[PDB]
Amino acid sequence: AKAQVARPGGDTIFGKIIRKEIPAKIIFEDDRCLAFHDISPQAPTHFLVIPKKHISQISVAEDDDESLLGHLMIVGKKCAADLGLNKGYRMVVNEGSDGGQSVYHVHLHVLGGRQMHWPPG
Amino acid sequence: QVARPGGDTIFGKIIRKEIPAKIIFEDDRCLAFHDISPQAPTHFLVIPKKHISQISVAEDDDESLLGHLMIVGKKCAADLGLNKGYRMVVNEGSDGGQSVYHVHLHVLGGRQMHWPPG
Numbered sequence: 001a002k003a004q005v006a007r008p009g010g011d012t013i014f015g016k017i018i019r020k021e022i023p024a025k026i027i028f029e030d031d032r033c034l035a036f037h038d039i040s041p042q043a044p045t046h047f048l049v050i051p052k053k054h055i056s057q058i059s060v061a062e063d064d065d066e067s068l069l070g071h072l073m074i075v076g077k078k079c080a081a082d083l084g085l086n087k088g089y090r091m092v093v094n095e096g097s098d099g100g101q102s103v104y105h106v107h108l109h110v111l112g113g114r115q116m117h118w119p120p121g
Numbered sequence: 122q123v124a125r126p127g128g129d130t131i132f133g134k135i136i137r138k139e140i141p142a143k144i145i146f147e148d149d150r151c152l153a154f155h156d157i158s159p160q161a162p163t164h165f166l167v168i169p170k171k172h173i174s175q176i177s178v179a180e181d182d183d184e185s186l187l188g189h190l191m192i193v194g195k196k197c198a199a200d201l202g203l204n205k206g207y208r209m210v211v212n213e214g215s216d217g218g219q220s221v222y223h224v225h226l227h228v229l230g231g232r233q234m235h236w237p238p239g
Contacts, residue, residue, distance in 0.1 A: 042237035058195050058209070070188030073211070077176050080213075088214020091176070092238045093191065095198070096206020100234050109238070117239035118218050119160035119229070120210045 008056040014105040027079050035079050044113030045083055049076045055106045058095050072108045085112035126174045126222045145197045153197050162231030163201055167194045173224040176213050190226045203230035
């Protein structure tokens with residue numbers, strides 16, 4: 001076990017979801033982001049908020065992306081209220097291998113509907 | 122008993138330098154410092170100076186400030202040597218595990234983080 005190949009700037013399944021080429025349960029859309037239920041949910045409610053812009057990893061985000069990344073969080077909290085997560089929730093961004101990043105397209109996880117535990121992985 | 126949402130927190134003491142903390146970064150909008158109950162070899166918080174009690178009550182105009190928390194987070198992670206990655210967390214309410222009602226972004230790294238994230 002050794003060989004690896006990666007294309008961080010390349011297309012991902014989340015690109016395909018944004019382009020509507022493959023289905024997803026869409027919760028919210030606007031001109032700059034998409035919110036949809038996770039296909040491998042880890043809580044009774046688990047959705048993602050992703051930018052339309054392909055920022056591959058938060059580690060390579062630019063200063064001028066601050067509004068957009070904040071917009072993910074605002075959209076995430078609004079969607080959580082509309083889905084009834086009034087007892088609370090956890091927001092998560094994963095970076096790289098130690099962070100458990102599954103897809104090279106920045107994504108904010110929102111999890112709720114159960115007690116979330118500590119440490120957060 | 123019960124610090125209620127809207128009440129001051131320990132973070133006010135850390136901002137005013139009334140208790141010791143290992144401060145990583147400070148600007149006019151936010152402060153980053155190491156967590157005193159770390160859950161990974163690197164574990165730090167990024168907090169706004171504006172008192173936002175809970176992410177559920179952030180206003181629309183707080184967008185750029187919340188974004189700024191993530192940008193400072195990622196800068197600080199790079200400066201602390203987290204070249205293999207890290208995990209960012211914001212908790213809301215009881216199910217989120219929050220009791221300290223001031224918005225705070227966790228950054229954890231220096232070990233493999235697992236799934237699910239709690």
